[PDB]
UniProtKB/TrEMBL annotation, chain A:
Main location: nucleus
Ranges where the Core Histone H2A/H2B/H3 domain occurs: 11-98
Name the record gives this protein: Histone H3
Naturally occurring in which organism (per UniProt): Xenopus laevis (African clawed frog)
GO CC list: nucleosome; nucleus
Length: 101, 412, 402
C-alpha cells in the first residue's frame, strides 16, 4: 500500500501558462538590488565617487526591460522563421544584425 | 447498482450494492488554509479572447469556447466574467457535468467501473475529491493507519507538500483500478485559482468496456503488491519493484526555513518505522551518517534503541565496521561534562555496548570507549567491564532461556 | 471518581408505609448521609407515593450503588420496585442508571446493633444502624470482621452440630481462619490511624497479637506516628525484633516502596535486585532512588524472563543463608503488586441464595412427608396461593384441592 501521485504536466503547457501570466501583468522582472549593484559597478569606470537618484535607476531598469523584451520579441520571430521552437544565439545575432546593432 | 441513499444499511465493507457505510463528499475541504496564495493578486481574472455571436444556436451554431479557446488549451476553466457568460462550456467543474458511471464487480482483484454507453476521447468523467492533509499529519497518520491492516490506501499527492485522503469521505472515483493499458488519465486543471484533479478519456471507449487510469507507480512500506490485469506487458506489480521513502511517497515537505533537526528526525523515524531495528547495511550506513548529525538527547536515545532492537548480527558487525564505536565514543565524551540529565543516555549507551558484538578489547581501546567506561550507572558500567573481561559480577539475574519462556507461556 | 464507591445501604423495616432507613455511606469505610422513606405501597392503594419518595431520596444524594435488604415477599417486591424506579429514572447517581445489588439482611442486621454501630450512631434509629451495617458489609467485609469482638463471631451459628461439640474448638478455628485471612489480605497501617471503620484490625495479624496491636495503636495515637514504612515499628521502638520479624509480612503502609506488601526487610534487598534485573535498569543502592525498576515494574510486568528462579535461589543460598525457590514467586508478586487482597469477589444473591438471605427458609429445612401448614390467603385462578409459616409463598395447586 502506497501513495500514488496523479500525473505530470505535458511539457510546454506550464510554459504557455507562464507566457500568459507574465503577459497579463505589468511589473519589474529583474532583481532590484543586483541591478543597482551592477549599475554602480559599471558606472565606477567613468567617474569615481558618484551618487544616484532612485528614479534615475528606476528609469534605467524600465528601459532595459523594454529593450530586452523587444529583442526577444524579434528573436522569437527569427526562430520561428528558422522552423525551430528552441531559441538560439544565432537567432539573437541575426536579430541584432538586421535591426542594425 | 449504485443506489445512493442516506440511510445506512447492512453491507459491511465492499460497497458494491450499498454505498452508505462511509460518507460521500462534494468538492474537497481544507484544514489549515491561509491567505498566502496567487489567488486574487495576479490570477484575479484570466479572461479568454473571444468575439462571439451567441444569437444563432441549433442552426449554423458553433459551440462556445471549443478547442480554440485560450484557456482550454492551457487547462484553465473560465470564470463568471466570460464574454459568453452562461453559455461557455469550459466551466465543467462548476456545472457538475459528469459522465454516466456504474460500479459492479468485474474481477477478483477488486471493485471498479465499466462504461455505460459510448464515450469519446478528451471527455471528462469524474473529479477526484477527498480530504486535504498538511505537512505534519501525513507522516503520523500513515504510520497510525498502517497498523490497522487495510488493503486500500486512498492517498494522492497534489503537490510536494499536499496529500489528499479519499478514505473517510469519497466520491464515485475511488473505485477505479490500475492497468498497464490505460484508456483514461488524470489532468491537473486550475479552477478559481485552486488546483483540482480530473479524469479524462483518451479514445473511443465502447459501451460496456473498462475505464481505468494509469498509476504513477509508488510503494511505501517493505511489502510489494501486484496487478491482475495482464493486458500485454503489465508490469506485474503496483508500485514496481523500487522502494521509496515516506517523504518521497508524499513529496518531502517544503522545509520551513528553520531546523536541520527535522531532517534527522525524519530519517530516524524512517529507520524506526520497521520497528525491528536495522534490517540491512544500507540502513546501517544511514544510521551511521545520522549519528554524526544528531545533537539532541531524544535522537541519541532513539538511535541507541534502534541499535539495541537490531537483532541482525551482520547489521551489528557492519555498524562496528563503520566506526560505530567511535560515534558512540563522541557522545560518551560529550557526556563527560557532568550534567545530571545524561544518566539515562549513559545507561542506554552501556546497554548498546553490551548488545554490540565487540570481538576484542583492542577494538574498545582503539575506539577509546574503554577508558570512558572505566571512568563511568556505575554498576551498569561495572557489568559492561565484567562482560568485556570475564568472570565475577555485580551479580546478574540470569534471564531464562527462550525455551523456558515458551514452555511457561504454554502452561497457562 | 473517588476512592471506592458510595454504597447506599437500604434496610427497610417493613415497606408497608413505615420508615425504612436508606443511608449512603462512602467507599472509605464511613457513612456519608442517610434518609427515611415512610411512604410505602400504609396506603392500601398508593402506587405513586413510594415512587415519589424513592425519586426524592435518589435526587437528595449521589450514591455509587444500592444495597437493598429483604425479609419476605413484600420486602423483595419493595426492593424490586425501588430498583426499577431507580433504573427507569436514572436515580443511581442522578446522571446514569445505577444497579441496586441485593444484600442479604444477615450481616448488616447484626452489625447495626453492635458496639461499632452504637458508637458511630447513638441518636439514630435501628433502620439507620442496619443500613450502615449493610453498607459496611457490602464495602469492606474484612474491616467489619476485624472491628468485632472474637462473642461477635460466636453470634453467627456455623451449623447445628457445633452446639453439641465443644465451642472452644469452633472459636479457635474461627480465630485461626480470621488470622489467616488477615495475613493473606494484609493490613493497612494508615487505614487504622484515623478512620474508625478501618480501625482495630491489628488483632488477627501473624505474630501481632491483640495486646500487641492495642499497644501499637495506642502508641500511634499518642506519638502521632504514621505508617512511614515497614520499619516504622522497628525504628520508633514500638515493636520488638521478634515481633517485627513475625509480623513483617502482615504489616502494610500507604507509602518504603516495598513497605505496603509482603516484602520484609530481610527480603527488601533481594526484591530490589530482582526488580533491577527484570527491568534491566541501573543498580545503585536501589531502595528509593532508582525509580525505573520499582515504579515501572509495579505499574506493569516489565520483564519476567530476566528473573530466573535458579539464579535467585543460588544467590539466596550463597548470600542470605536461605533458599528462595519458594519465596522467589512471593517476592516477585509483592514487587509487582503491593497490598494484594486475599478476599473473594462480590457475590450477587442467587435464587436459592436470595431466598435464604431474605425469606430465611430454604427448601432444605422442609422435607417431604412432614406436615407443613399452608396459610391459604388467596387464589389467583383456581388454586389457593397464600403464605406459609416461614414466609414462603405457599401456592396450593388445583391438585391439592381437587
Amino acid at each position: 500500500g502506497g501513495v500514488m501521485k496523479p500525473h505530470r504536466y505535458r511539457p510546454g503547457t506550464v510554459a504557455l501558462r507562464e507566457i500568459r501570466r507574465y503577459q497579463k501583468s505589468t511589473e519589474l522582472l529583474i532583481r532590484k538590488l543586483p541591478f543597482q549593484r551592477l549599475v554602480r559597478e559599471i558606472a565606477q569606470d567613468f567617474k569615481t565617487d558618484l551618487r544616484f537618484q532612485s528614479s534615475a535607476v528606476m528609469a534605467l531598469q524600465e528601459a532595459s526591460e523594454a529593450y530586452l523584451v523587444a529583442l526577444f520579441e524579434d528573436t522569437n520571430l527569427c526562430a520561428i522563421h528558422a522552423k525551430r521552437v528552441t531559441i538560439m544565439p544565432k537567432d539573437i545575432q541575426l536579430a541584432r544584425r538586421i535591426r542594425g546593432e | 447498482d449504485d443506489f445512493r441513499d442516506p440511510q445506512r444499511w447492512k453491507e459491511c465493507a465492499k460497497q458494491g450494492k450499498m454505498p452508505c457505510y462511509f460518507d460521500l463528499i462534494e468538492e474537497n475541504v481544507y484544514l489549515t488554509e491561509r491567505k498566502k496564495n496567487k489567488s486574487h493578486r495576479d490570477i484575479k481574472r484570466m479572461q479568454c479572447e473571444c468575439t462571439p455571436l451567441s444569437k444563432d444556436e441549433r442552426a449554423q451554431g458553433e459551440i462556445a469556447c471549443g478547442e480554440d479557446c485560450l484557456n482550454r488549451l492551457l487547462m484553465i476553466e473560465c470564470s463568471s466574467r466570460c464574454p459568453n457568460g452562461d453559455y461557455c462550456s469550459n466551466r465543467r467543474f462548476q456545472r457538475k457535468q459528469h459522465a454516466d458511471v456504474e460500479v459492479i464487480l468485474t474481477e477478483k482483484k477488486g471493485w471498479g467501473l465499466r462504461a455505460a454507453k459510448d464515450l469519446p476521447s478528451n471527455t471528462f468523467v469524474l473529479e477526484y475529491c477527498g480530504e486535504v492533509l498538511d505537512h505534519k499529519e501525513f507522516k503520523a497518520r500513515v504510520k497510525e493507519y498502517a497498523r490497522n491492516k487495510n488493503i486500500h490506501y486512498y492517498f494522492m499527492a497534489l503537490k510536494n507538500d499536499e496529500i489528499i485522503d479519499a478514505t473517510q469521505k469519497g466520491n464515485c472515483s475511488r473505485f477505479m483500478n490500475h492497468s498497464c493499458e490505460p484508456n483514461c488519465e488524470t489532468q491537473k486543471w486550475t479552477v478559481n485559482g485552486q488546483l483540482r484533479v480530473g479524469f479524462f478519456t483518451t479514445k473511443l471507449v465502447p459501451s460496456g468496456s473498462e475505464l481505468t487510469f494509469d498509476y504513477q507507480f509508488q510503494r511505501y512500506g517493505k511489502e510489494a503488491q501486484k496487478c491482475f490485469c495482464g493486458s500485454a506487458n503489465c508490469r506485474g506489480y503496483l508500485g514496481g519493484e523500487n522502494r521509496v521513502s515516506i517523504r518521497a511517497a508524499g513529496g518531502k515537505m517544503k522545509k520551513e526555513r528553520s531546523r536541520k533537526k527535522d531532517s534527522v528526525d525524519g530519517e530516524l523515524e524512517a529507520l524506526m518505522e520497521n520497528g525491528e531495528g536495522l534490517s540491512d547495511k544500507n540502513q546501517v550506513l544511514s544510521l551511521s551518517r545520522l549519528m554524526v548529525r544528531i545533537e539532541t538527547l531524544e535522537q541519541k536515545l532513539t538511535c541507541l534503541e534502534l541499535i539495541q532492537n537490531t537483532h541482525s548480527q551482520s547489521c551489528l558487525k557492519s555498524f562496528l565496521e563503520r566506526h560505530g564505536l567511535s560515534l558512540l565514543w563522541i557522545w560518551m565524551a560529550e557526556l563527560g561534562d557532568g550534567r545530571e540529565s545524561n544518566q539515562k543516555l549513559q545507561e542506554e549507551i552501556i546497554k548498546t555496548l553490551e548488545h554490540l558484538p565487540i570481538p576484542t578489547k583492542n577494538m574498545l581501546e582503539e575506539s577509546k570507549v574503554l577508558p570512558i567506561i572505566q571512568r563511568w550507572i556505575s554498576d551498569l558500567a561495572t557489568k559492561l567491564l565484567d562482560s568485556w573481561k570475564d568472570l565475577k559480577e555485580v551479580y546478574r539475574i540470569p534471564k531464562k532461556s527462550q525455551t523456558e519462556k515458551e514452555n511457561t507461556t504454554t502452561e497457562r | 471518581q473517588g476512592k471506592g464507591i458510595r454504597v447506599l445501604g437500604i434496610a427497610f423495616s417493613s415497606a408497608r408505609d413505615h420508615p425504612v432507613f436508606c443511608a449512603l455511606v462512602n467507599g472509605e469505610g464511613e457513612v456519608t448521609d442517610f434518609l427515611r422513606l415512610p411512604h410505602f405501597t400504609e396506603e392500601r392503594e398508593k402506587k405513586a407515593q413510594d415512587i415519589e419518595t424513592l425519586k426524592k431520596f435518589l435526587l437528595n444524594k449521589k450514591p455509587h450503588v444500592v444495597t437493598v435488604a429483604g425479609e419476605n415477599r413484600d420486602a423483595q417486591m419493595l426492593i424490586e420496585d425501588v430498583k426499577r424506579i431507580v433504573h427507569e429514572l436514572d436515580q443511581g447517581q442522578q446522571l446514569s442508571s445505577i444497579g441496586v445489588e441485593l444484600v442479604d439482611n444477615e450481616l448488616a442486621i447484626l452489625y447495626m446493633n453492635s458496639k461499632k454501630s452504637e458508637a458511630e450512631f447513638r441518636d439514630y434509629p435501628p433502620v439507620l444502624r442496619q443500613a450502615v451495617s449493610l453498607a459496611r458489609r457490602i464495602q469492606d467485609p474484612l474491616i467489619e470482621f476485624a472491628q468485632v469482638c472474637s462473642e461477635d463471631i460466636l453470634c453467627l451459628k456455623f451449623h447445628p452440630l457445633q452446639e453439641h461439640v465443644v465451642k472452644e474448638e469452633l472459636l479457635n478455628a474461627l480465630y485461626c481462619e480470621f488470622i489467616n485471612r488477615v495475613n493473606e489480605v494484609g493490613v493497612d497501617v494508615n487505614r487504622a490511624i484515623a478512620h474508625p471503620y478501618s480501625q482495630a484490625l491489628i488483632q488477627y495479624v501473624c505474630g501481632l497479637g491483640p495486646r500487641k496491636g492495642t499497644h501499637l495503636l495506642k502508641i500511634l495515637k499518642q506519638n502521632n506516628t504514621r505508617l512511614e514504612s515497614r520499619t516504622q515499628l522497628v525504628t520508633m521502638c514500638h515493636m520488638g525484633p521478634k515481633v517485627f520479624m513475625n509480623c513483617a509480612g502482615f504489616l502494610k503502609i500507604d507509602t518504603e516502596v516495598l513497605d505496603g506488601s509482603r516484602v520484609h526487610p530481610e527480603t527488601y534487598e533481594w526484591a530490589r535486585k530482582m526488580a533491577v534485573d527484570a527491568l534491566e535498569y541501573d543498580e545503585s543502592a536501589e531502595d528509593a532512588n532508582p525509580a525505573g525498576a520499582l515504579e515501572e515494574i509495579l505499574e506493569n510486568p516489565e520483564r519476567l524472563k530476566d528473573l530466573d528462579l535458579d539464579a535467585f535461589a543460588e544467590e539466596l543460598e550463597r548470600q542470605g543463608y536461605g533458599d528462595k525457590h519458594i519465596t522467589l514467586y512471593d517476592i516477585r508478586a509483592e514487587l509487582s503488586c503491593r497490598y494484594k487482597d486475599l478476599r473473594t469477589a462480590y457475590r450477587s444473591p442467587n435464587t436459592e441464595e436470595i431466598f435464604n438471605m431474605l425469606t430465611k427458609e430454604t427448601p432444605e429445612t422442609f422435607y417431604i412427608g412432614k406436615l407443613i401448614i399452608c396459610n391459604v390467603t388467596g387464589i389467583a385462578h383456581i388454586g389457593v396461593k397464600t403464605r406459609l409459616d416461614n414466609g414462603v409463598t405457599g401456592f396450593i395447586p388445583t391438585k391439592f384441592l381437587s
